[PDB]
Ligand binder design. Structure first.
Ligand SMILES: *[C@@H]1O[C@H](CO)[C@@H](O[C@@H]2O[C@H](CO)[C@@H](O[C@@H]3O[C@H](CO[C@H]4O[C@H](CO)[C@@H](O)[C@H](O)[C@@H]4O)[C@@H](O)[C@H](O[C@H]4O[C@H](CO)[C@@H](O)[C@H](O)[C@@H]4O)[C@@H]3O)[C@H](O)[C@H]2NC(C)=O)[C@H](O)[C@H]1NC(C)=O
Ligand code: HX7
Ligand code: NAG
Ligand code: NAG
Ligand code: NAG
Ligand code: CL
Ligand code: CL
Ligand code: CL
Ligand code: CL
Ligand code: CL
Ligand code: CL
Ligand code: NA
Lengths: 359, 359
């Protein structure tokens, strides 16, 4: 009876493929599916980018997928899949990729994600600046795409209140940073915000401790990369950072993505003159004419009751209403001292300890 | 002298005998060229064809030409070049249509002008005819920022009384069912309009602009090479009076281009082997680039960009475009034919008309 509509996925393991199947299978039970009925098509990540592009063509687009779920490879990026699917204007839904570069519409012209880019951590910092009445901050960021992205996002929030007394950029890979950090020390503001990779945050932390800038008086406010791996290992006690709740749970995001995509398909097919996507890549060089419409329907999708909370997307197709743990390094243990619940800061009953010993 | 393999890939093109005849080499190395004919220009056809070549023979380099308007072909080739670390020259067609922000590891070089060079020619044209008030329309097609930036920075450092009235940014990754592109174009007042987008994007945008009365007399639209594209294919939406900068097979024929492509790659490899007593080993496979990447590099780039052949400077920029190409200014006249109306040469403009004839 029903028209079969294939959804595609590139996922980390075969376990995650089966979770994708069952998620689609449950969408079919939930929904009214006399007219259209979803079907799951999936592979796991190929060992390199060229194989991965070929697989998207051979295994997914040959099944005429309306959309493709992509997880970030756990140990190679979503990029080849964004490229090849973007060639046809088939939407790609990123499940766990956080890099801000996937927000650039020129490079990734049909890419949504159910997690926020790292640069959106600026939204949480800003609420924390209101709450804790830090009205003068210094912003140190890596002079790469990610660091600059964080800067722009925080500045948009500040410019249009709390103010940024100064912004300092440094060359990614630089080990001694005392020149940069001596410029920050001479300023009157004592709240420092950092965007940087694991390794670059390590370098910062070491230089700052050498300059006695990690002690009482100072506040350090930081994201998730900057309290991971080796950064965590040299981080100064009392530092505040963030962790995206369910941010690495591929299984949760498969569930939510499939719910959102199923909703959007059934909504798409309420409209007139929906065309099928191209069957296979070979000999096909035109875009899927309905692809840009389907993108719009996804962009404006709302799914309140998501496993990762309230799903909506912003004008770049990035997750809104994402939830963060607010973490505080006490006695060298990361402790949760509250959450950002998507719109609101909620302090829990565990006390924050600031750099030095402050209370 | 030892032979290096060079693939010449021709899509849709039969000057095959004229081409083998235009192609002599006195250097440390001699080319073994292999003409290959392709029919399809989707991602799978292009990737597998080039990867088959690399696996069946020993390819030091690829010279690529097509007869399409498909700018994606350049994107695909940059990706293939970056991943396999193999020199690819896109000398004609979609393959030559500007690819802005090539990969860091790209060895992909294009015949034709940079974006910035075209922007600069467009302002010279406007100066010639004292058109000083203008607006800009772009899509999100990559390059759009370089375009706007180059304009803005040229005119803001100029005693000339430029007036940039409006800059529109059109999002054609979404459907246009709410007539948003109409609404945005309605805002345009300027008598000169610079348009940066793809040929297919331009034909929709012109269709809409016509409907709101912006294509007739007292509006003059100016566009870059990739919008005119193949000047024997003229969408009916293109308005008479359209001016374009062009590097589409005018005075620089495909036969000559293939010859120069072969020379650039052959010379580069000769120069390297002279200075270093090796050249890079032709990749045996693109299906294991992940293993063999610590053994590869884009060393050959620094030679690829500094070649002169038969007493001619064929330099590329590091950014992967021809250094000083002779550009042809063209006009879409009352007969819907593209007509030569200028040359840009030795960095001087020479126009045919002192006053524009009727459209
Ligand atoms: C993150 O956390 C925030 C803040 O806690 C949540 O936002 C709140 O959501 C709750 C619902 O769970 C809302 O509570 C309702 O408030 C209504 C009035 O709101 C006005 O007044 C408040 C307080 O000044 C303002 O914050 C708000 O902007 C409005 O001006 C009440 O009318 C509701 O009462 C209803 O339910 C009760 C309980 O059953 C009944 O007794 C009543 O009869 C009535 O039916 C209710 O109390 C609250 O308004 C929200 N606040 C804000 C600031 O948005 C987010 O939901 C949460 N995010 C996630 C994803 O969990
Ligand atoms: C650094 C920039 C890389 C660009 N990347 C390459 C696309 C690509 C690369 C490789 C392959 Cl295999 C394929 Cl199939 C496709 C994406 C591609 O260029 C996107 O192309 C468009 C981007 C934007 C637009 N304009 S728009 C957003 O509709 O209004 C039109 C086309
Ligand atoms: C991941 O999410 C799923 C729900 O989809 C849940 O069952 C599981 O406990 C989560 N895993 C972690 C580590 O929280
Ligand atoms: C391309 O088309 C030509 C002309 O028909 C044909 O001879 C050739 O076999 C085709 N190539 C492929 C790969 O099919
Ligand atoms: C490029 O042109 C010639 C060598 O071909 C020489 O004058 C110049 O130094 C070259 N530049 C290099 C090698 O970077
Ligand atoms: Cl295929
Ligand atoms: Cl707390
Ligand atoms: Cl073919
Ligand atoms: Cl690439
Ligand atoms: Cl171009
Ligand atoms: Cl086009
Ligand atoms: Na996006």
């Amino acid at each position: 009876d029903p028209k079969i509509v294939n959804i595609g996925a590139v996922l980390s393991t075969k376990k995650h493929e089966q979770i994708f199947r069952e998620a689609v299978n449950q969408a079919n039970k939930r929904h009214f599916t006399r007219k259209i009925q979803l079907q799951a098509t999936s592979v796991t990540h190929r060992p390199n980018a060229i194989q991965m592009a070929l697989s998207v063509c051979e295994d997914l687009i040959s099944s005429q997928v309306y959309a493709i779920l992509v997880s970030h490879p756990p140990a190679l990026t979503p990029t080849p899949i964004s490229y090849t699917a973007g060639f046809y204007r088939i939407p790609v839904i990123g499940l766990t990729t956080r890099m801000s570069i996937y927000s650039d519409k020129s490079i990734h012209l049909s890419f949504l994600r159910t997690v926020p880019p790292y640069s959106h951590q600026a939204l949480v910092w800003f609420e924390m600046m209101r709450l804790f009445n830090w009205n003068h901050v210094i912003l140190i960021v890596s002079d790469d795409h990610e660091g600059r992205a964080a800067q722009k996002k925080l500045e948009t929030l500040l410019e249009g209140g709390p103010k940024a007394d100064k912004v300092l950029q440094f060359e990614p890979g630089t080990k001694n940073l005392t020149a940069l950090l001596l410029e920050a020390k001479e300023l009157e503001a004592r709240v420092i915000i950092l965007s940087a990779s694991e390794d670059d945050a390590t370098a910062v932390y070491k230089s700052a401790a050498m300059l006695d800038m990690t002690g009482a008086g100072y506040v350090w406010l930081v994201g998730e990369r900057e309290i991971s791996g080796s950064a965590l290992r040299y981080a100064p006690d009392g530092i505040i950072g963030l962790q995206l709740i369910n941010g690495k749970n591929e299984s949760a995001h498969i569930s939510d993505a499939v719910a959102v995509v199923a909703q959007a398909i059934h909504e798409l097919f309420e409209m007139e003159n929906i065309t099928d996507p191209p069957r296979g890549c070979v000999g096909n060089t035109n875009i899927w004419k309905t692809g840009p419409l389907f993108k719009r329907v996804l962009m404006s999708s709302k799914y309140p009751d998501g496993v990762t909370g309230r799903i909506e997307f912003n004008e770049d197709g990035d997750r809104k209403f994402a939830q963060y743990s607010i973490m505080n390094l006490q006695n060298r243990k990361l402790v949760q001292v509250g959450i950002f619940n998507g719109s609101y800061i909620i302090q829990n009953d565990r006390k924050i300890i600031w750099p030095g010993g402050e209370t | 002298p030892p032979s290096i393999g060079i693939a010449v890939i021709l899509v849709g093109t039969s000057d095959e005998v004229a081409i083998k005849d235009a192609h002599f080499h006195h250097l440390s190395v001699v080319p073994r060229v292999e003409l290959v004919a392709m029919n399809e220009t989707d991602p799978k056809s292009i990737i597998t064809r080039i990867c088959d070549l690399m696996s069946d023979r020993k390819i030091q380099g690829v010279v690529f030409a097509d007869d399409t308007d498909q700018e994606a072909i350049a994107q695909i080739l940059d990706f293939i070049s970056a991943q396999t670390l193999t020199p690819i020259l896109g000398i004609h067609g979609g393959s030559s249509m500007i690819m802005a922000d090539k990969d860091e590891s790209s060895m992909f070089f294009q015949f034709g002008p940079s974006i910035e060079q075209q922007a600069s020619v467009m302002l010279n044209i406007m100066e010639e005819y004292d058109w000083y008030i203008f607006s800009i329309v772009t899509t999100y097609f990559p390059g759009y920022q370089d375009f706007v930036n180059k304009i803005r920075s040229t005119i803001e450092n100029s005693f000339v009384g430029w007036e940039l009235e409006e800059v529109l940014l059109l999002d054609m990754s979404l459907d246009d069912g709410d007539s948003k592109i109409q609404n945005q174009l309605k805002k345009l007042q300027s008598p000169i309009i610079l348009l940066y987008c793809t040929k297919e994007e331009a034909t929709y945008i012109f269709e809409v602009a016509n409907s709101v009365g912006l294509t007739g007399y007292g509006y003059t639209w100016i566009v870059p090479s990739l919008v005119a594209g193949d000047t024997d294919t003229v969408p009916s939406e293109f308005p008479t009076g359209l001016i374009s900068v062009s590097y589409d097979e005018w005075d620089y024929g495909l036969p000559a281009r293939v010859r120069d492509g072969i020379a650039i790659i052959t010379t580069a490899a000769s120069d390297m082997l002279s200075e270093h007593s090796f050249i890079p080993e032709p990749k045996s496979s693109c299906y294991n680039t992940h293993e063999k990447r610590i053994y590869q590099s884009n060393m050959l780039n620094r030679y690829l960009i500094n070649v002169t052949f038969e007493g001619r400077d064929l330099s590329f920029s590091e950014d992967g475009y021809q250094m000083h190409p002779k550009l042809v200014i063209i006009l879409l006249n009352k007969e819907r034919k593209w007509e030569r109306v200028g040359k840009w040469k030795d960095k001087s403009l020479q126009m045919k008309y002192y006053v524009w004839p009727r459209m």
